[PDB]
Amino acid sequence: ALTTISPHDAQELIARGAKLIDIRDADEYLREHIPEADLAPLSVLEQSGLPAKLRHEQIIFHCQAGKRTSNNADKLAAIAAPAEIFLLEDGIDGWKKAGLPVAVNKSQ
């Protein structure tokens, strides 16, 4: 059920078996994204919905900072089900703060 977790807790959940869906934009993830995540912008979800591969038993949603995650949790909770859904603390900004890996080409 829609619950909120720390910027590091998500990592362990994905390791145990959860997932990370990126709802920001498709073009933005092309540059610098997370390896644990895939990609699934809201634009696609609102249209076709969740793909049969990004439907792990439990998943988590994150944005740039989070102004669009909990914001549509109402419908997102439906589109994503059957499976569990959670919201990130400060989106991907927290992923960087946590010192977690990313698909970048340099340290910054």
Side-chain angles (χ1 to χ4, degrees):
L2 294 171
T3 307
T4 314
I5 84 302
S6 306
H8 181 260
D9 270 55
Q11 214 229 177
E12 204 168 42
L13 294 171
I14 300 142
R16 298 164 176 174
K19 246 289 175 201
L20 206 57
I21 273 53
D22 193 71
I23 71 176
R24 297 156 46 190
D25 280 311
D27 299 9
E28 285 198 20
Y29 232 42
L30 203 165
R31 281 206 172 187
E32 51 206 88
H33 70 97
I34 294 164
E36 306 282 47
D38 185 2
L39 175 57
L42 220 335
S43 199
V44 170
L45 273 275
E46 279 255 14
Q47 286 175 90
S48 192
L50 189 78
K53 310 306 193 185
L54 299 180
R55 64 146 159 84
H56 270 204
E57 291 155 69
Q58 311 194 55
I59 88 177
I60 302 146
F61 296 133
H62 66 2
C63 299
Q64 66 306 98
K67 304 306 184 192
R68 273 199 286 244
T69 0
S70 42
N71 180 102
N72 269 317
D74 172 82
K75 109 242 293 294
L76 286 165
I79 299 163
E84 282 55 81
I85 38 274
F86 299 81
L87 287 318
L88 230 303
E89 200 283 272
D90 204 319
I92 200 261
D93 188 35
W95 200 267
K96 295 194 182 200
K97 284 167 159 73
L100 290 172
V102 271
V104 295
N105 216 108
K106 272 185 168 67
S107 44
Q108 290 185 230

mmCIF file of all heavy atoms in Angstrom, residues 26-50:
data_model
loop_
_atom_site.group_PDB
_atom_site.id
_atom_site.type_symbol
_atom_site.label_atom_id
_atom_site.label_comp_id
_atom_site.label_asym_id
_atom_site.label_seq_id
_atom_site.Cartn_x
_atom_site.Cartn_y
_atom_site.Cartn_z
ATOM 1 N N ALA A 26 11.171 10.423 -20.506
ATOM 2 C CA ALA A 26 11.995 9.402 -21.152
ATOM 3 C C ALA A 26 13.360 9.949 -21.559
ATOM 4 O O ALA A 26 14.390 9.307 -21.348
ATOM 5 C CB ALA A 26 11.282 8.865 -22.394
ATOM 6 N N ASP A 27 13.354 11.156 -22.113
ATOM 7 C CA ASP A 27 14.541 11.840 -22.603
ATOM 8 C C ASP A 27 15.502 12.189 -21.469
ATOM 9 O O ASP A 27 16.716 12.165 -21.674
ATOM 10 C CB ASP A 27 14.149 13.137 -23.333
ATOM 11 C CG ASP A 27 13.255 12.988 -24.568
ATOM 12 O OD1 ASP A 27 12.738 11.886 -24.865
ATOM 13 O OD2 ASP A 27 12.988 14.029 -25.204
ATOM 14 N N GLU A 28 14.995 12.542 -20.282
ATOM 15 C CA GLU A 28 15.860 12.902 -19.163
ATOM 16 C C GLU A 28 16.630 11.699 -18.609
ATOM 17 O O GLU A 28 17.786 11.869 -18.212
ATOM 18 C CB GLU A 28 15.075 13.579 -18.029
ATOM 19 C CG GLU A 28 14.682 15.038 -18.331
ATOM 20 C CD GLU A 28 14.289 15.849 -17.081
ATOM 21 O OE1 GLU A 28 14.649 15.473 -15.940
ATOM 22 O OE2 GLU A 28 13.672 16.935 -17.229
ATOM 23 N N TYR A 29 16.028 10.505 -18.580
ATOM 24 C CA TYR A 29 16.681 9.317 -18.056
ATOM 25 C C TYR A 29 17.808 8.851 -18.987
ATOM 26 O O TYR A 29 18.783 8.270 -18.523
ATOM 27 C CB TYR A 29 15.605 8.247 -17.763
ATOM 28 C CG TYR A 29 15.637 7.651 -16.357
ATOM 29 C CD1 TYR A 29 15.847 8.482 -15.236
ATOM 30 C CD2 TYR A 29 15.435 6.271 -16.156
ATOM 31 C CE1 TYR A 29 15.926 7.939 -13.944
ATOM 32 C CE2 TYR A 29 15.474 5.726 -14.857
ATOM 33 C CZ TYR A 29 15.731 6.558 -13.744
ATOM 34 O OH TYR A 29 15.834 6.020 -12.499
ATOM 35 N N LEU A 30 17.740 9.184 -20.279
ATOM 36 C CA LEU A 30 18.744 8.825 -21.279
ATOM 37 C C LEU A 30 20.132 9.335 -20.861
ATOM 38 O O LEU A 30 21.145 8.654 -21.027
ATOM 39 C CB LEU A 30 18.289 9.431 -22.623
ATOM 40 C CG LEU A 30 18.840 8.755 -23.894
ATOM 41 C CD1 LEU A 30 18.005 9.213 -25.099
ATOM 42 C CD2 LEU A 30 20.308 9.102 -24.167
ATOM 43 N N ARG A 31 20.190 10.555 -20.310
ATOM 44 C CA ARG A 31 21.445 11.166 -19.885
ATOM 45 C C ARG A 31 22.061 10.534 -18.649
ATOM 46 O O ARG A 31 23.164 9.991 -18.745
ATOM 47 C CB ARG A 31 21.298 12.678 -19.666
ATOM 48 C CG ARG A 31 21.317 13.418 -21.003
ATOM 49 C CD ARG A 31 21.801 14.857 -20.811
ATOM 50 N NE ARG A 31 22.001 15.529 -22.099
ATOM 51 C CZ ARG A 31 22.539 16.736 -22.283
ATOM 52 N NH1 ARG A 31 23.066 17.428 -21.282
ATOM 53 N NH2 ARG A 31 22.543 17.256 -23.495
ATOM 54 N N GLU A 32 21.409 10.668 -17.500
ATOM 55 C CA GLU A 32 21.872 10.156 -16.209
ATOM 56 C C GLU A 32 20.717 9.552 -15.415
ATOM 57 O O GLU A 32 19.883 10.284 -14.875
ATOM 58 C CB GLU A 32 22.637 11.245 -15.426
ATOM 59 C CG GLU A 32 21.940 12.608 -15.259
ATOM 60 C CD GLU A 32 22.937 13.758 -15.074
ATOM 61 O OE1 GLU A 32 23.389 14.341 -16.087
ATOM 62 O OE2 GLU A 32 23.228 14.144 -13.916
ATOM 63 N N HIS A 33 20.696 8.219 -15.310
ATOM 64 C CA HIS A 33 19.664 7.470 -14.597
ATOM 65 C C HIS A 33 20.239 6.500 -13.564
ATOM 66 O O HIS A 33 21.449 6.467 -13.344
ATOM 67 C CB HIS A 33 18.785 6.729 -15.601
ATOM 68 C CG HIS A 33 19.425 5.561 -16.318
ATOM 69 N ND1 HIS A 33 19.315 4.228 -15.964
ATOM 70 C CD2 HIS A 33 20.161 5.624 -17.470
ATOM 71 C CE1 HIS A 33 19.966 3.505 -16.891
ATOM 72 N NE2 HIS A 33 20.487 4.310 -17.831
ATOM 73 N N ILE A 34 19.381 5.715 -12.904
ATOM 74 C CA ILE A 34 19.763 4.732 -11.892
ATOM 75 C C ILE A 34 19.801 3.347 -12.555
ATOM 76 O O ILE A 34 18.904 3.047 -13.345
ATOM 77 C CB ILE A 34 18.756 4.793 -10.720
ATOM 78 C CG1 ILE A 34 18.904 6.158 -10.022
ATOM 79 C CG2 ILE A 34 18.965 3.659 -9.696
ATOM 80 C CD1 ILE A 34 17.724 6.473 -9.114
ATOM 81 N N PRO A 35 20.777 2.483 -12.215
ATOM 82 C CA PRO A 35 20.890 1.140 -12.784
ATOM 83 C C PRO A 35 19.801 0.180 -12.285
ATOM 84 O O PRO A 35 19.363 -0.689 -13.030
ATOM 85 C CB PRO A 35 22.268 0.632 -12.350
ATOM 86 C CG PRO A 35 22.565 1.407 -11.067
ATOM 87 C CD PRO A 35 21.883 2.746 -11.304
ATOM 88 N N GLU A 36 19.359 0.345 -11.038
ATOM 89 C CA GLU A 36 18.337 -0.477 -10.386
ATOM 90 C C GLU A 36 16.944 -0.285 -11.003
ATOM 91 O O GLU A 36 16.052 -1.130 -10.852
ATOM 92 C CB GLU A 36 18.216 -0.118 -8.898
ATOM 93 C CG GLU A 36 19.530 -0.189 -8.127
ATOM 94 C CD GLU A 36 19.983 -1.597 -7.750
ATOM 95 O OE1 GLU A 36 19.958 -2.503 -8.609
ATOM 96 O OE2 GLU A 36 20.492 -1.782 -6.617
ATOM 97 N N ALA A 37 16.724 0.886 -11.601
ATOM 98 C CA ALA A 37 15.480 1.277 -12.229
ATOM 99 C C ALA A 37 15.477 0.915 -13.705
ATOM 100 O O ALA A 37 16.474 0.455 -14.258
ATOM 101 C CB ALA A 37 15.328 2.800 -12.112
ATOM 102 N N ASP A 38 14.315 1.102 -14.324
ATOM 103 C CA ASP A 38 14.154 0.867 -15.758
ATOM 104 C C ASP A 38 13.838 2.234 -16.351
ATOM 105 O O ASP A 38 14.752 3.042 -16.472
ATOM 106 C CB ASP A 38 13.132 -0.220 -16.100
ATOM 107 C CG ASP A 38 13.093 -0.501 -17.615
ATOM 108 O OD1 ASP A 38 13.866 0.090 -18.401
ATOM 109 O OD2 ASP A 38 12.316 -1.376 -18.058
ATOM 110 N N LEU A 39 12.566 2.526 -16.625
ATOM 111 C CA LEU A 39 12.023 3.761 -17.181
ATOM 112 C C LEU A 39 10.545 3.490 -17.455
ATOM 113 O O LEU A 39 10.215 2.408 -17.940
ATOM 114 C CB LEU A 39 12.721 4.148 -18.503
ATOM 115 C CG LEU A 39 12.103 5.372 -19.203
ATOM 116 C CD1 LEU A 39 12.090 6.608 -18.291
ATOM 117 C CD2 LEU A 39 12.891 5.672 -20.481
ATOM 118 N N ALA A 40 9.656 4.423 -17.112
ATOM 119 C CA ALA A 40 8.216 4.306 -17.336
ATOM 120 C C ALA A 40 7.577 5.662 -17.002
ATOM 121 O O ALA A 40 6.986 5.808 -15.929
ATOM 122 C CB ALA A 40 7.615 3.142 -16.531
ATOM 123 N N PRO A 41 7.700 6.665 -17.891
ATOM 124 C CA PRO A 41 7.145 7.983 -17.652
ATOM 125 C C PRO A 41 5.627 7.905 -17.506
ATOM 126 O O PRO A 41 4.966 7.050 -18.099
ATOM 127 C CB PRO A 41 7.607 8.867 -18.813
ATOM 128 C CG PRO A 41 7.944 7.878 -19.922
ATOM 129 C CD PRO A 41 8.362 6.610 -19.182
ATOM 130 N N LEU A 42 5.060 8.841 -16.743
ATOM 131 C CA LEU A 42 3.625 8.922 -16.496
ATOM 132 C C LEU A 42 2.877 8.995 -17.818
ATOM 133 O O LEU A 42 1.798 8.433 -17.937
ATOM 134 C CB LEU A 42 3.271 10.163 -15.665
ATOM 135 C CG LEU A 42 2.186 9.995 -14.574
ATOM 136 C CD1 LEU A 42 1.167 8.863 -14.775
ATOM 137 C CD2 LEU A 42 2.853 9.799 -13.214
ATOM 138 N N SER A 43 3.464 9.652 -18.821
ATOM 139 C CA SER A 43 2.867 9.785 -20.134
ATOM 140 C C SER A 43 2.481 8.405 -20.690
ATOM 141 O O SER A 43 1.432 8.276 -21.317
ATOM 142 C CB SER A 43 3.862 10.515 -21.050
ATOM 143 O OG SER A 43 3.203 11.052 -22.177
ATOM 144 N N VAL A 44 3.329 7.394 -20.491
ATOM 145 C CA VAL A 44 3.110 6.027 -20.970
ATOM 146 C C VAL A 44 2.072 5.329 -20.094
ATOM 147 O O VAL A 44 1.188 4.637 -20.595
ATOM 148 C CB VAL A 44 4.467 5.285 -20.987
ATOM 149 C CG1 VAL A 44 4.372 3.773 -21.233
ATOM 150 C CG2 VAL A 44 5.352 5.903 -22.075
ATOM 151 N N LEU A 45 2.159 5.527 -18.782
ATOM 152 C CA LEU A 45 1.257 4.938 -17.801
ATOM 153 C C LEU A 45 -0.174 5.411 -18.021
ATOM 154 O O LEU A 45 -1.101 4.606 -18.026
ATOM 155 C CB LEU A 45 1.770 5.293 -16.404
ATOM 156 C CG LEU A 45 2.813 4.300 -15.850
ATOM 157 C CD1 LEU A 45 2.094 3.120 -15.193
ATOM 158 C CD2 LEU A 45 3.835 3.756 -16.854
ATOM 159 N N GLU A 46 -0.355 6.704 -18.236
ATOM 160 C CA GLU A 46 -1.656 7.303 -18.487
ATOM 161 C C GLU A 46 -2.258 6.755 -19.795
ATOM 162 O O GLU A 46 -3.479 6.679 -19.929
ATOM 163 C CB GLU A 46 -1.525 8.831 -18.528
ATOM 164 C CG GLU A 46 -1.513 9.411 -17.098
ATOM 165 C CD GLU A 46 -2.794 10.105 -16.629
ATOM 166 O OE1 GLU A 46 -3.877 9.984 -17.248
ATOM 167 O OE2 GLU A 46 -2.762 10.755 -15.558
ATOM 168 N N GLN A 47 -1.413 6.366 -20.758
ATOM 169 C CA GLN A 47 -1.808 5.818 -22.047
ATOM 170 C C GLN A 47 -1.953 4.290 -21.961
ATOM 171 O O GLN A 47 -3.048 3.790 -21.705
ATOM 172 C CB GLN A 47 -0.811 6.255 -23.144
ATOM 173 C CG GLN A 47 -0.970 7.733 -23.528
ATOM 174 C CD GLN A 47 0.100 8.168 -24.531
ATOM 175 O OE1 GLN A 47 -0.079 8.083 -25.746
ATOM 176 N NE2 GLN A 47 1.246 8.613 -24.055
ATOM 177 N N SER A 48 -0.877 3.536 -22.199
ATOM 178 C CA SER A 48 -0.854 2.075 -22.193
ATOM 179 C C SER A 48 -0.876 1.440 -20.805
ATOM 180 O O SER A 48 -1.370 0.315 -20.662
ATOM 181 C CB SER A 48 0.428 1.625 -22.903
ATOM 182 O OG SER A 48 0.425 0.237 -23.184
ATOM 183 N N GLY A 49 -0.352 2.115 -19.788
ATOM 184 C CA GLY A 49 -0.303 1.560 -18.442
ATOM 185 C C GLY A 49 1.056 0.914 -18.196
ATOM 186 O O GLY A 49 2.025 1.154 -18.924
ATOM 187 N N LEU A 50 1.156 0.166 -17.103
ATOM 188 C CA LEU A 50 2.375 -0.516 -16.692
ATOM 189 C C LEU A 50 2.677 -1.726 -17.600
ATOM 190 O O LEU A 50 1.773 -2.518 -17.879
ATOM 191 C CB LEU A 50 2.187 -0.956 -15.235
ATOM 192 C CG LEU A 50 3.483 -1.494 -14.613
ATOM 193 C CD1 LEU A 50 4.449 -0.372 -14.208
ATOM 194 C CD2 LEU A 50 3.116 -2.312 -13.381
#
